[PDB]
Amino acid sequence: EFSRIVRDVERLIAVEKYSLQGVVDGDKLLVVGFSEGSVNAYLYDGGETVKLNREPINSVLDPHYGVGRVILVRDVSKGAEQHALFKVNTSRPGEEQRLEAVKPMRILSGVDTGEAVVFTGATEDRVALYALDGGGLRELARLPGFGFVSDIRGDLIAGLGFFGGGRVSLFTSNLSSGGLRVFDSGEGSFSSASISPGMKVTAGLETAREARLVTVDPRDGSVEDLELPSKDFSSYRPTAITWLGYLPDGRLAVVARREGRSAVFIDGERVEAPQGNHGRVVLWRGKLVTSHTSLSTPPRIVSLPSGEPLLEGGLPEDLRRSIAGSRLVWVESFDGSRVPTYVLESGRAPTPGPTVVLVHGGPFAEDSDSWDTFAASLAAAGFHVVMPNYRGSTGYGEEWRLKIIGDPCGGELEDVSAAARWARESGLASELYIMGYSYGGYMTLCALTMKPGLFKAGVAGASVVDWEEMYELSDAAFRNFIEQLTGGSREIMRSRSPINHVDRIKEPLALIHPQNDSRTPLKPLLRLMGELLARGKTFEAHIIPDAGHAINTMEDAVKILLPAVFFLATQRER
Ligand SMILES: CCCCCCCCO[C@@H]1O[C@H](CO)[C@@H](O)[C@H](O)[C@H]1O
């Protein structure tokens, strides 16, 4: 209701947000910005920003340093994520030419050397690595599951693949001849990779314990630790490695992290940076630049080590104030595991007060000290926010992440429930709600069906309600995803699907869903609405038009977020 809720939700979404993609058109920053109502690509060279694309896009391919063009990735299916590629000569912004040799497909990742575009894509029958050059399109290799291109140097192509059991393998190929070589580590998963001058692969390896840098030789697969000049990086003992890449001057840039915050290193030496999380690091005009974000700082571009902002959307002081504080707490779970949980105390709610356990998606993702529009809106609306990194989350080692494999709506739901208990027992919460999108929405449905009475009400957006029907509606990448998560078991696919436990729901439920979502399809949700109806269950639903899982306009963001906040405010009335 409140026109107040609406203005805050609108304003939070309206704040401009930027991601750093690279350096192009000689020496200009290439950035993707959620600005002017949607997701666009821009060039930045010290002053005014110049828009490269026409209609909104979803992303751009990673350009090689200085290339004179940008490759836009744009959904041509009204949200179903069948993307087409469009190139823009950086000397003629606004003029696009579609790469017609590439039929629409789910584009997963890509790099542009300036002479060749190398990308991974998913169709109904497969996931593959492709190369498009002066001679046309070539399929370099068929991949086992989600795979992403990380880097290209010379004829060598390096990437990361989720090829089995939740583990991430490294893979290589040749631009000229294609082919596939998969490198698995028995110690953990590779998280980042960049080809060295010596033509070997430098990669971040996340183990049960610490994460570390290694050198993989493509020719024989031998692996050895990589030691850097400066020991700052090694003594930091990172638990995860976000990204790494060689700068033009040959120096190795690494962004690593622990407990939800990251640090920047150049050849092993620490480089001061604003507190929170950082993205890729680029050398621009001899200077270091990166993206930065934190729970109170929308994604922005800054210079290091000063932290001065090059591109930044301003968060209004009043909205900034609605977040009275934040903490990282370690929730005690059913089996004694400690669940790292970020907490946001609303300056507009009392203590104890209305609290929302906002569950992250993925499952391979994490709640860190990074901007979260959903969280900020709840705080502005008067709710404390509890964000737990349930098992399956990234950021706390290989072991914690892999526990979810073969156990959806099992141990991780116990962690979500423990975070709820902690909220109550610690004195923060007077009443509890659960809210989440994607895997998080799945968790809302799992909570309401398997833990009736735990929460007062639940919000489920772009959620999974039935693994079976979703599977039958999935492309090659998502079918493989579901097989890995469920261990390939039909029993698990069925028993862990909320659609088969509707009778147990007792709390009000709000369903929010983009009509053309191709990751978590709408069809099974319509069946869920039928069951709720037939069983006399209380519920509301909001289906968003011409949109899918990847929101790319400010108005669509309002359509998926506003109903959620209105629903909770109304429940809060009792
Ligand atoms: C209510 C929440 C709506 C989320 C929809 C987000 C659509 C675009 O997503 C945003 O793009 C920016 C530009 O690259 C990034 O800096 C932001 O981190 C990212 O969320």
Give all strands (DSSP E) within 176-286, no chain letters: 181-183, 188-195, 201-207, 211-216, 223-225, 240-246, 252-258, 261-266, 269-271, 277-284
Question: Amino acid identity of 202?
Answer: T
Q: What is the DSSP letter of 493?
A: H
Q: Minimal CA–CA distance to 312: which of 285, 295, 292, 282? A: 292
| Catalytic residue status for 177 | no
**Residue 361 and residue 293 share a domain:** no
300 and 355, same domain (yes or no): no
| Residue 468 near residue 493 (C-beta atoms within 8 A) | yes
Q: Ligand 1: does its nearest atom lie under 6 Å from the Cβ of 262?
A: no
Regarding whether 343 and 267 lie in a shared domain, the answer is: no
Q: Which residues pair with 343 in a beta bridge?
A: 327, 386
Note whether 308 and 301 are within 8 A (CB). Answer: no
Question: What are the structure tokens assigned to 439, written together?
Answer: 């895997």
Q: Quick one: 89 and 238 in the same domain? A: yes
* Resolution value (Å, 1 decimal): 2.1
**Of 283, 314, 345, which residue is a domain's last?**
314
**Residue 444, phi then psi, degrees to nearest 5:** -60, -45
Structure tokens at 347: 């300056």
Shared-domain flag, residues 289 and 396: no
At 479, list the tokens. 């079918």
E strand map for 113-217: 117-122, 127-133, 136-143, 147-153, 156-164, 167-174, 181-183, 188-195, 201-207, 211-216
Helix-helix angle 439-450:411-425, to 10 degrees: 80
Counted domains in the chain: 2
Element (H, E) at 375: helix 373-380
Residues 205 and 289 in one domain: yes
Q: Which of 314, 344, 365 is the last residue of a domain?
A: 314
Among candidate residues 497, 573, 20, 560, the one with its CA nearest the CA of residue 278: 20
Q: Which two tokens stand for residue 160?
A: 């990361």
Q: Are residues 406 and 367 in the same domain?
A: yes
Residues 418 and 495 in one domain: yes
Tell me, yes or no, if 549 is annotated catalytic: yes
Residues 328 and 453 in one domain: yes
Both tokens of 232, joined, read 């700052």
Final residue of a structural domain among 248, 279, 314: 314
Dihedral (CA of 554, 555, 561, 565) sign: positive
DSSP annotation string for 30-65: EEEEEETTEEEEEEESSSSEEE--SS--SEE-EEPT
Supply the CATH number for residue 195's domain: 2.130.10.150
293 touches 384 (CB < 8 A)? no
517 is catalytic: yes
* Consecutive H or E run containing 461: strand 457-461
Measured distance CA(421)–CA(458) in Å, rounded: 16
Say yes or no: CB of residue 34 within 6 Å of ligand 1: yes
How far is the C-alpha of 31 from the C-alpha of 301, rounded, in Å? 9
Experimental method: X-ray
Per DSSP, 352 falls in state: S
Order of strands across the sheet that contains 62-63: 62-63, 106-112, 117-122, 127-133, 136-143
Catalytic residue among 173, 185, 549, 556: 549
Q: Is 3 part of any domain?
A: no
* Alpha carbon distance 482, 524 (integer Å): 15
The residue nearest atom 5 of ligand 1, judged by CA position, is 551
18 lines ligand 1 (CB under 6 A): yes
On whether both 407 and 290 belong to a single domain, the answer is no
Q: Which residues are within 8 A (CB) of 265 and not within 5 positions of it... i.e. 6 or more apart?
A: 228, 230, 232, 233, 236, 253, 254, 255, 256, 271
State the residue range of the domain holding 226: 15-314
Q: Return phi, psi of residue 393, to 5°.
A: -70, 155
- The counts of H helices and E strands in the chain are 12, 37
The answer to whether residues 568 and 356 touch, using CB atoms and an 8 Å cutoff, is yes
Ligand 1, atom 17: nearest CA belongs to which residue? 17
Same domain, yes or no: 238 and 275: yes
Angstrom distance (rounded) from CA 489 to CA 493: 6
Contact 431, 572 (CB under 8 A): yes
Residue 2 maps to a domain: no
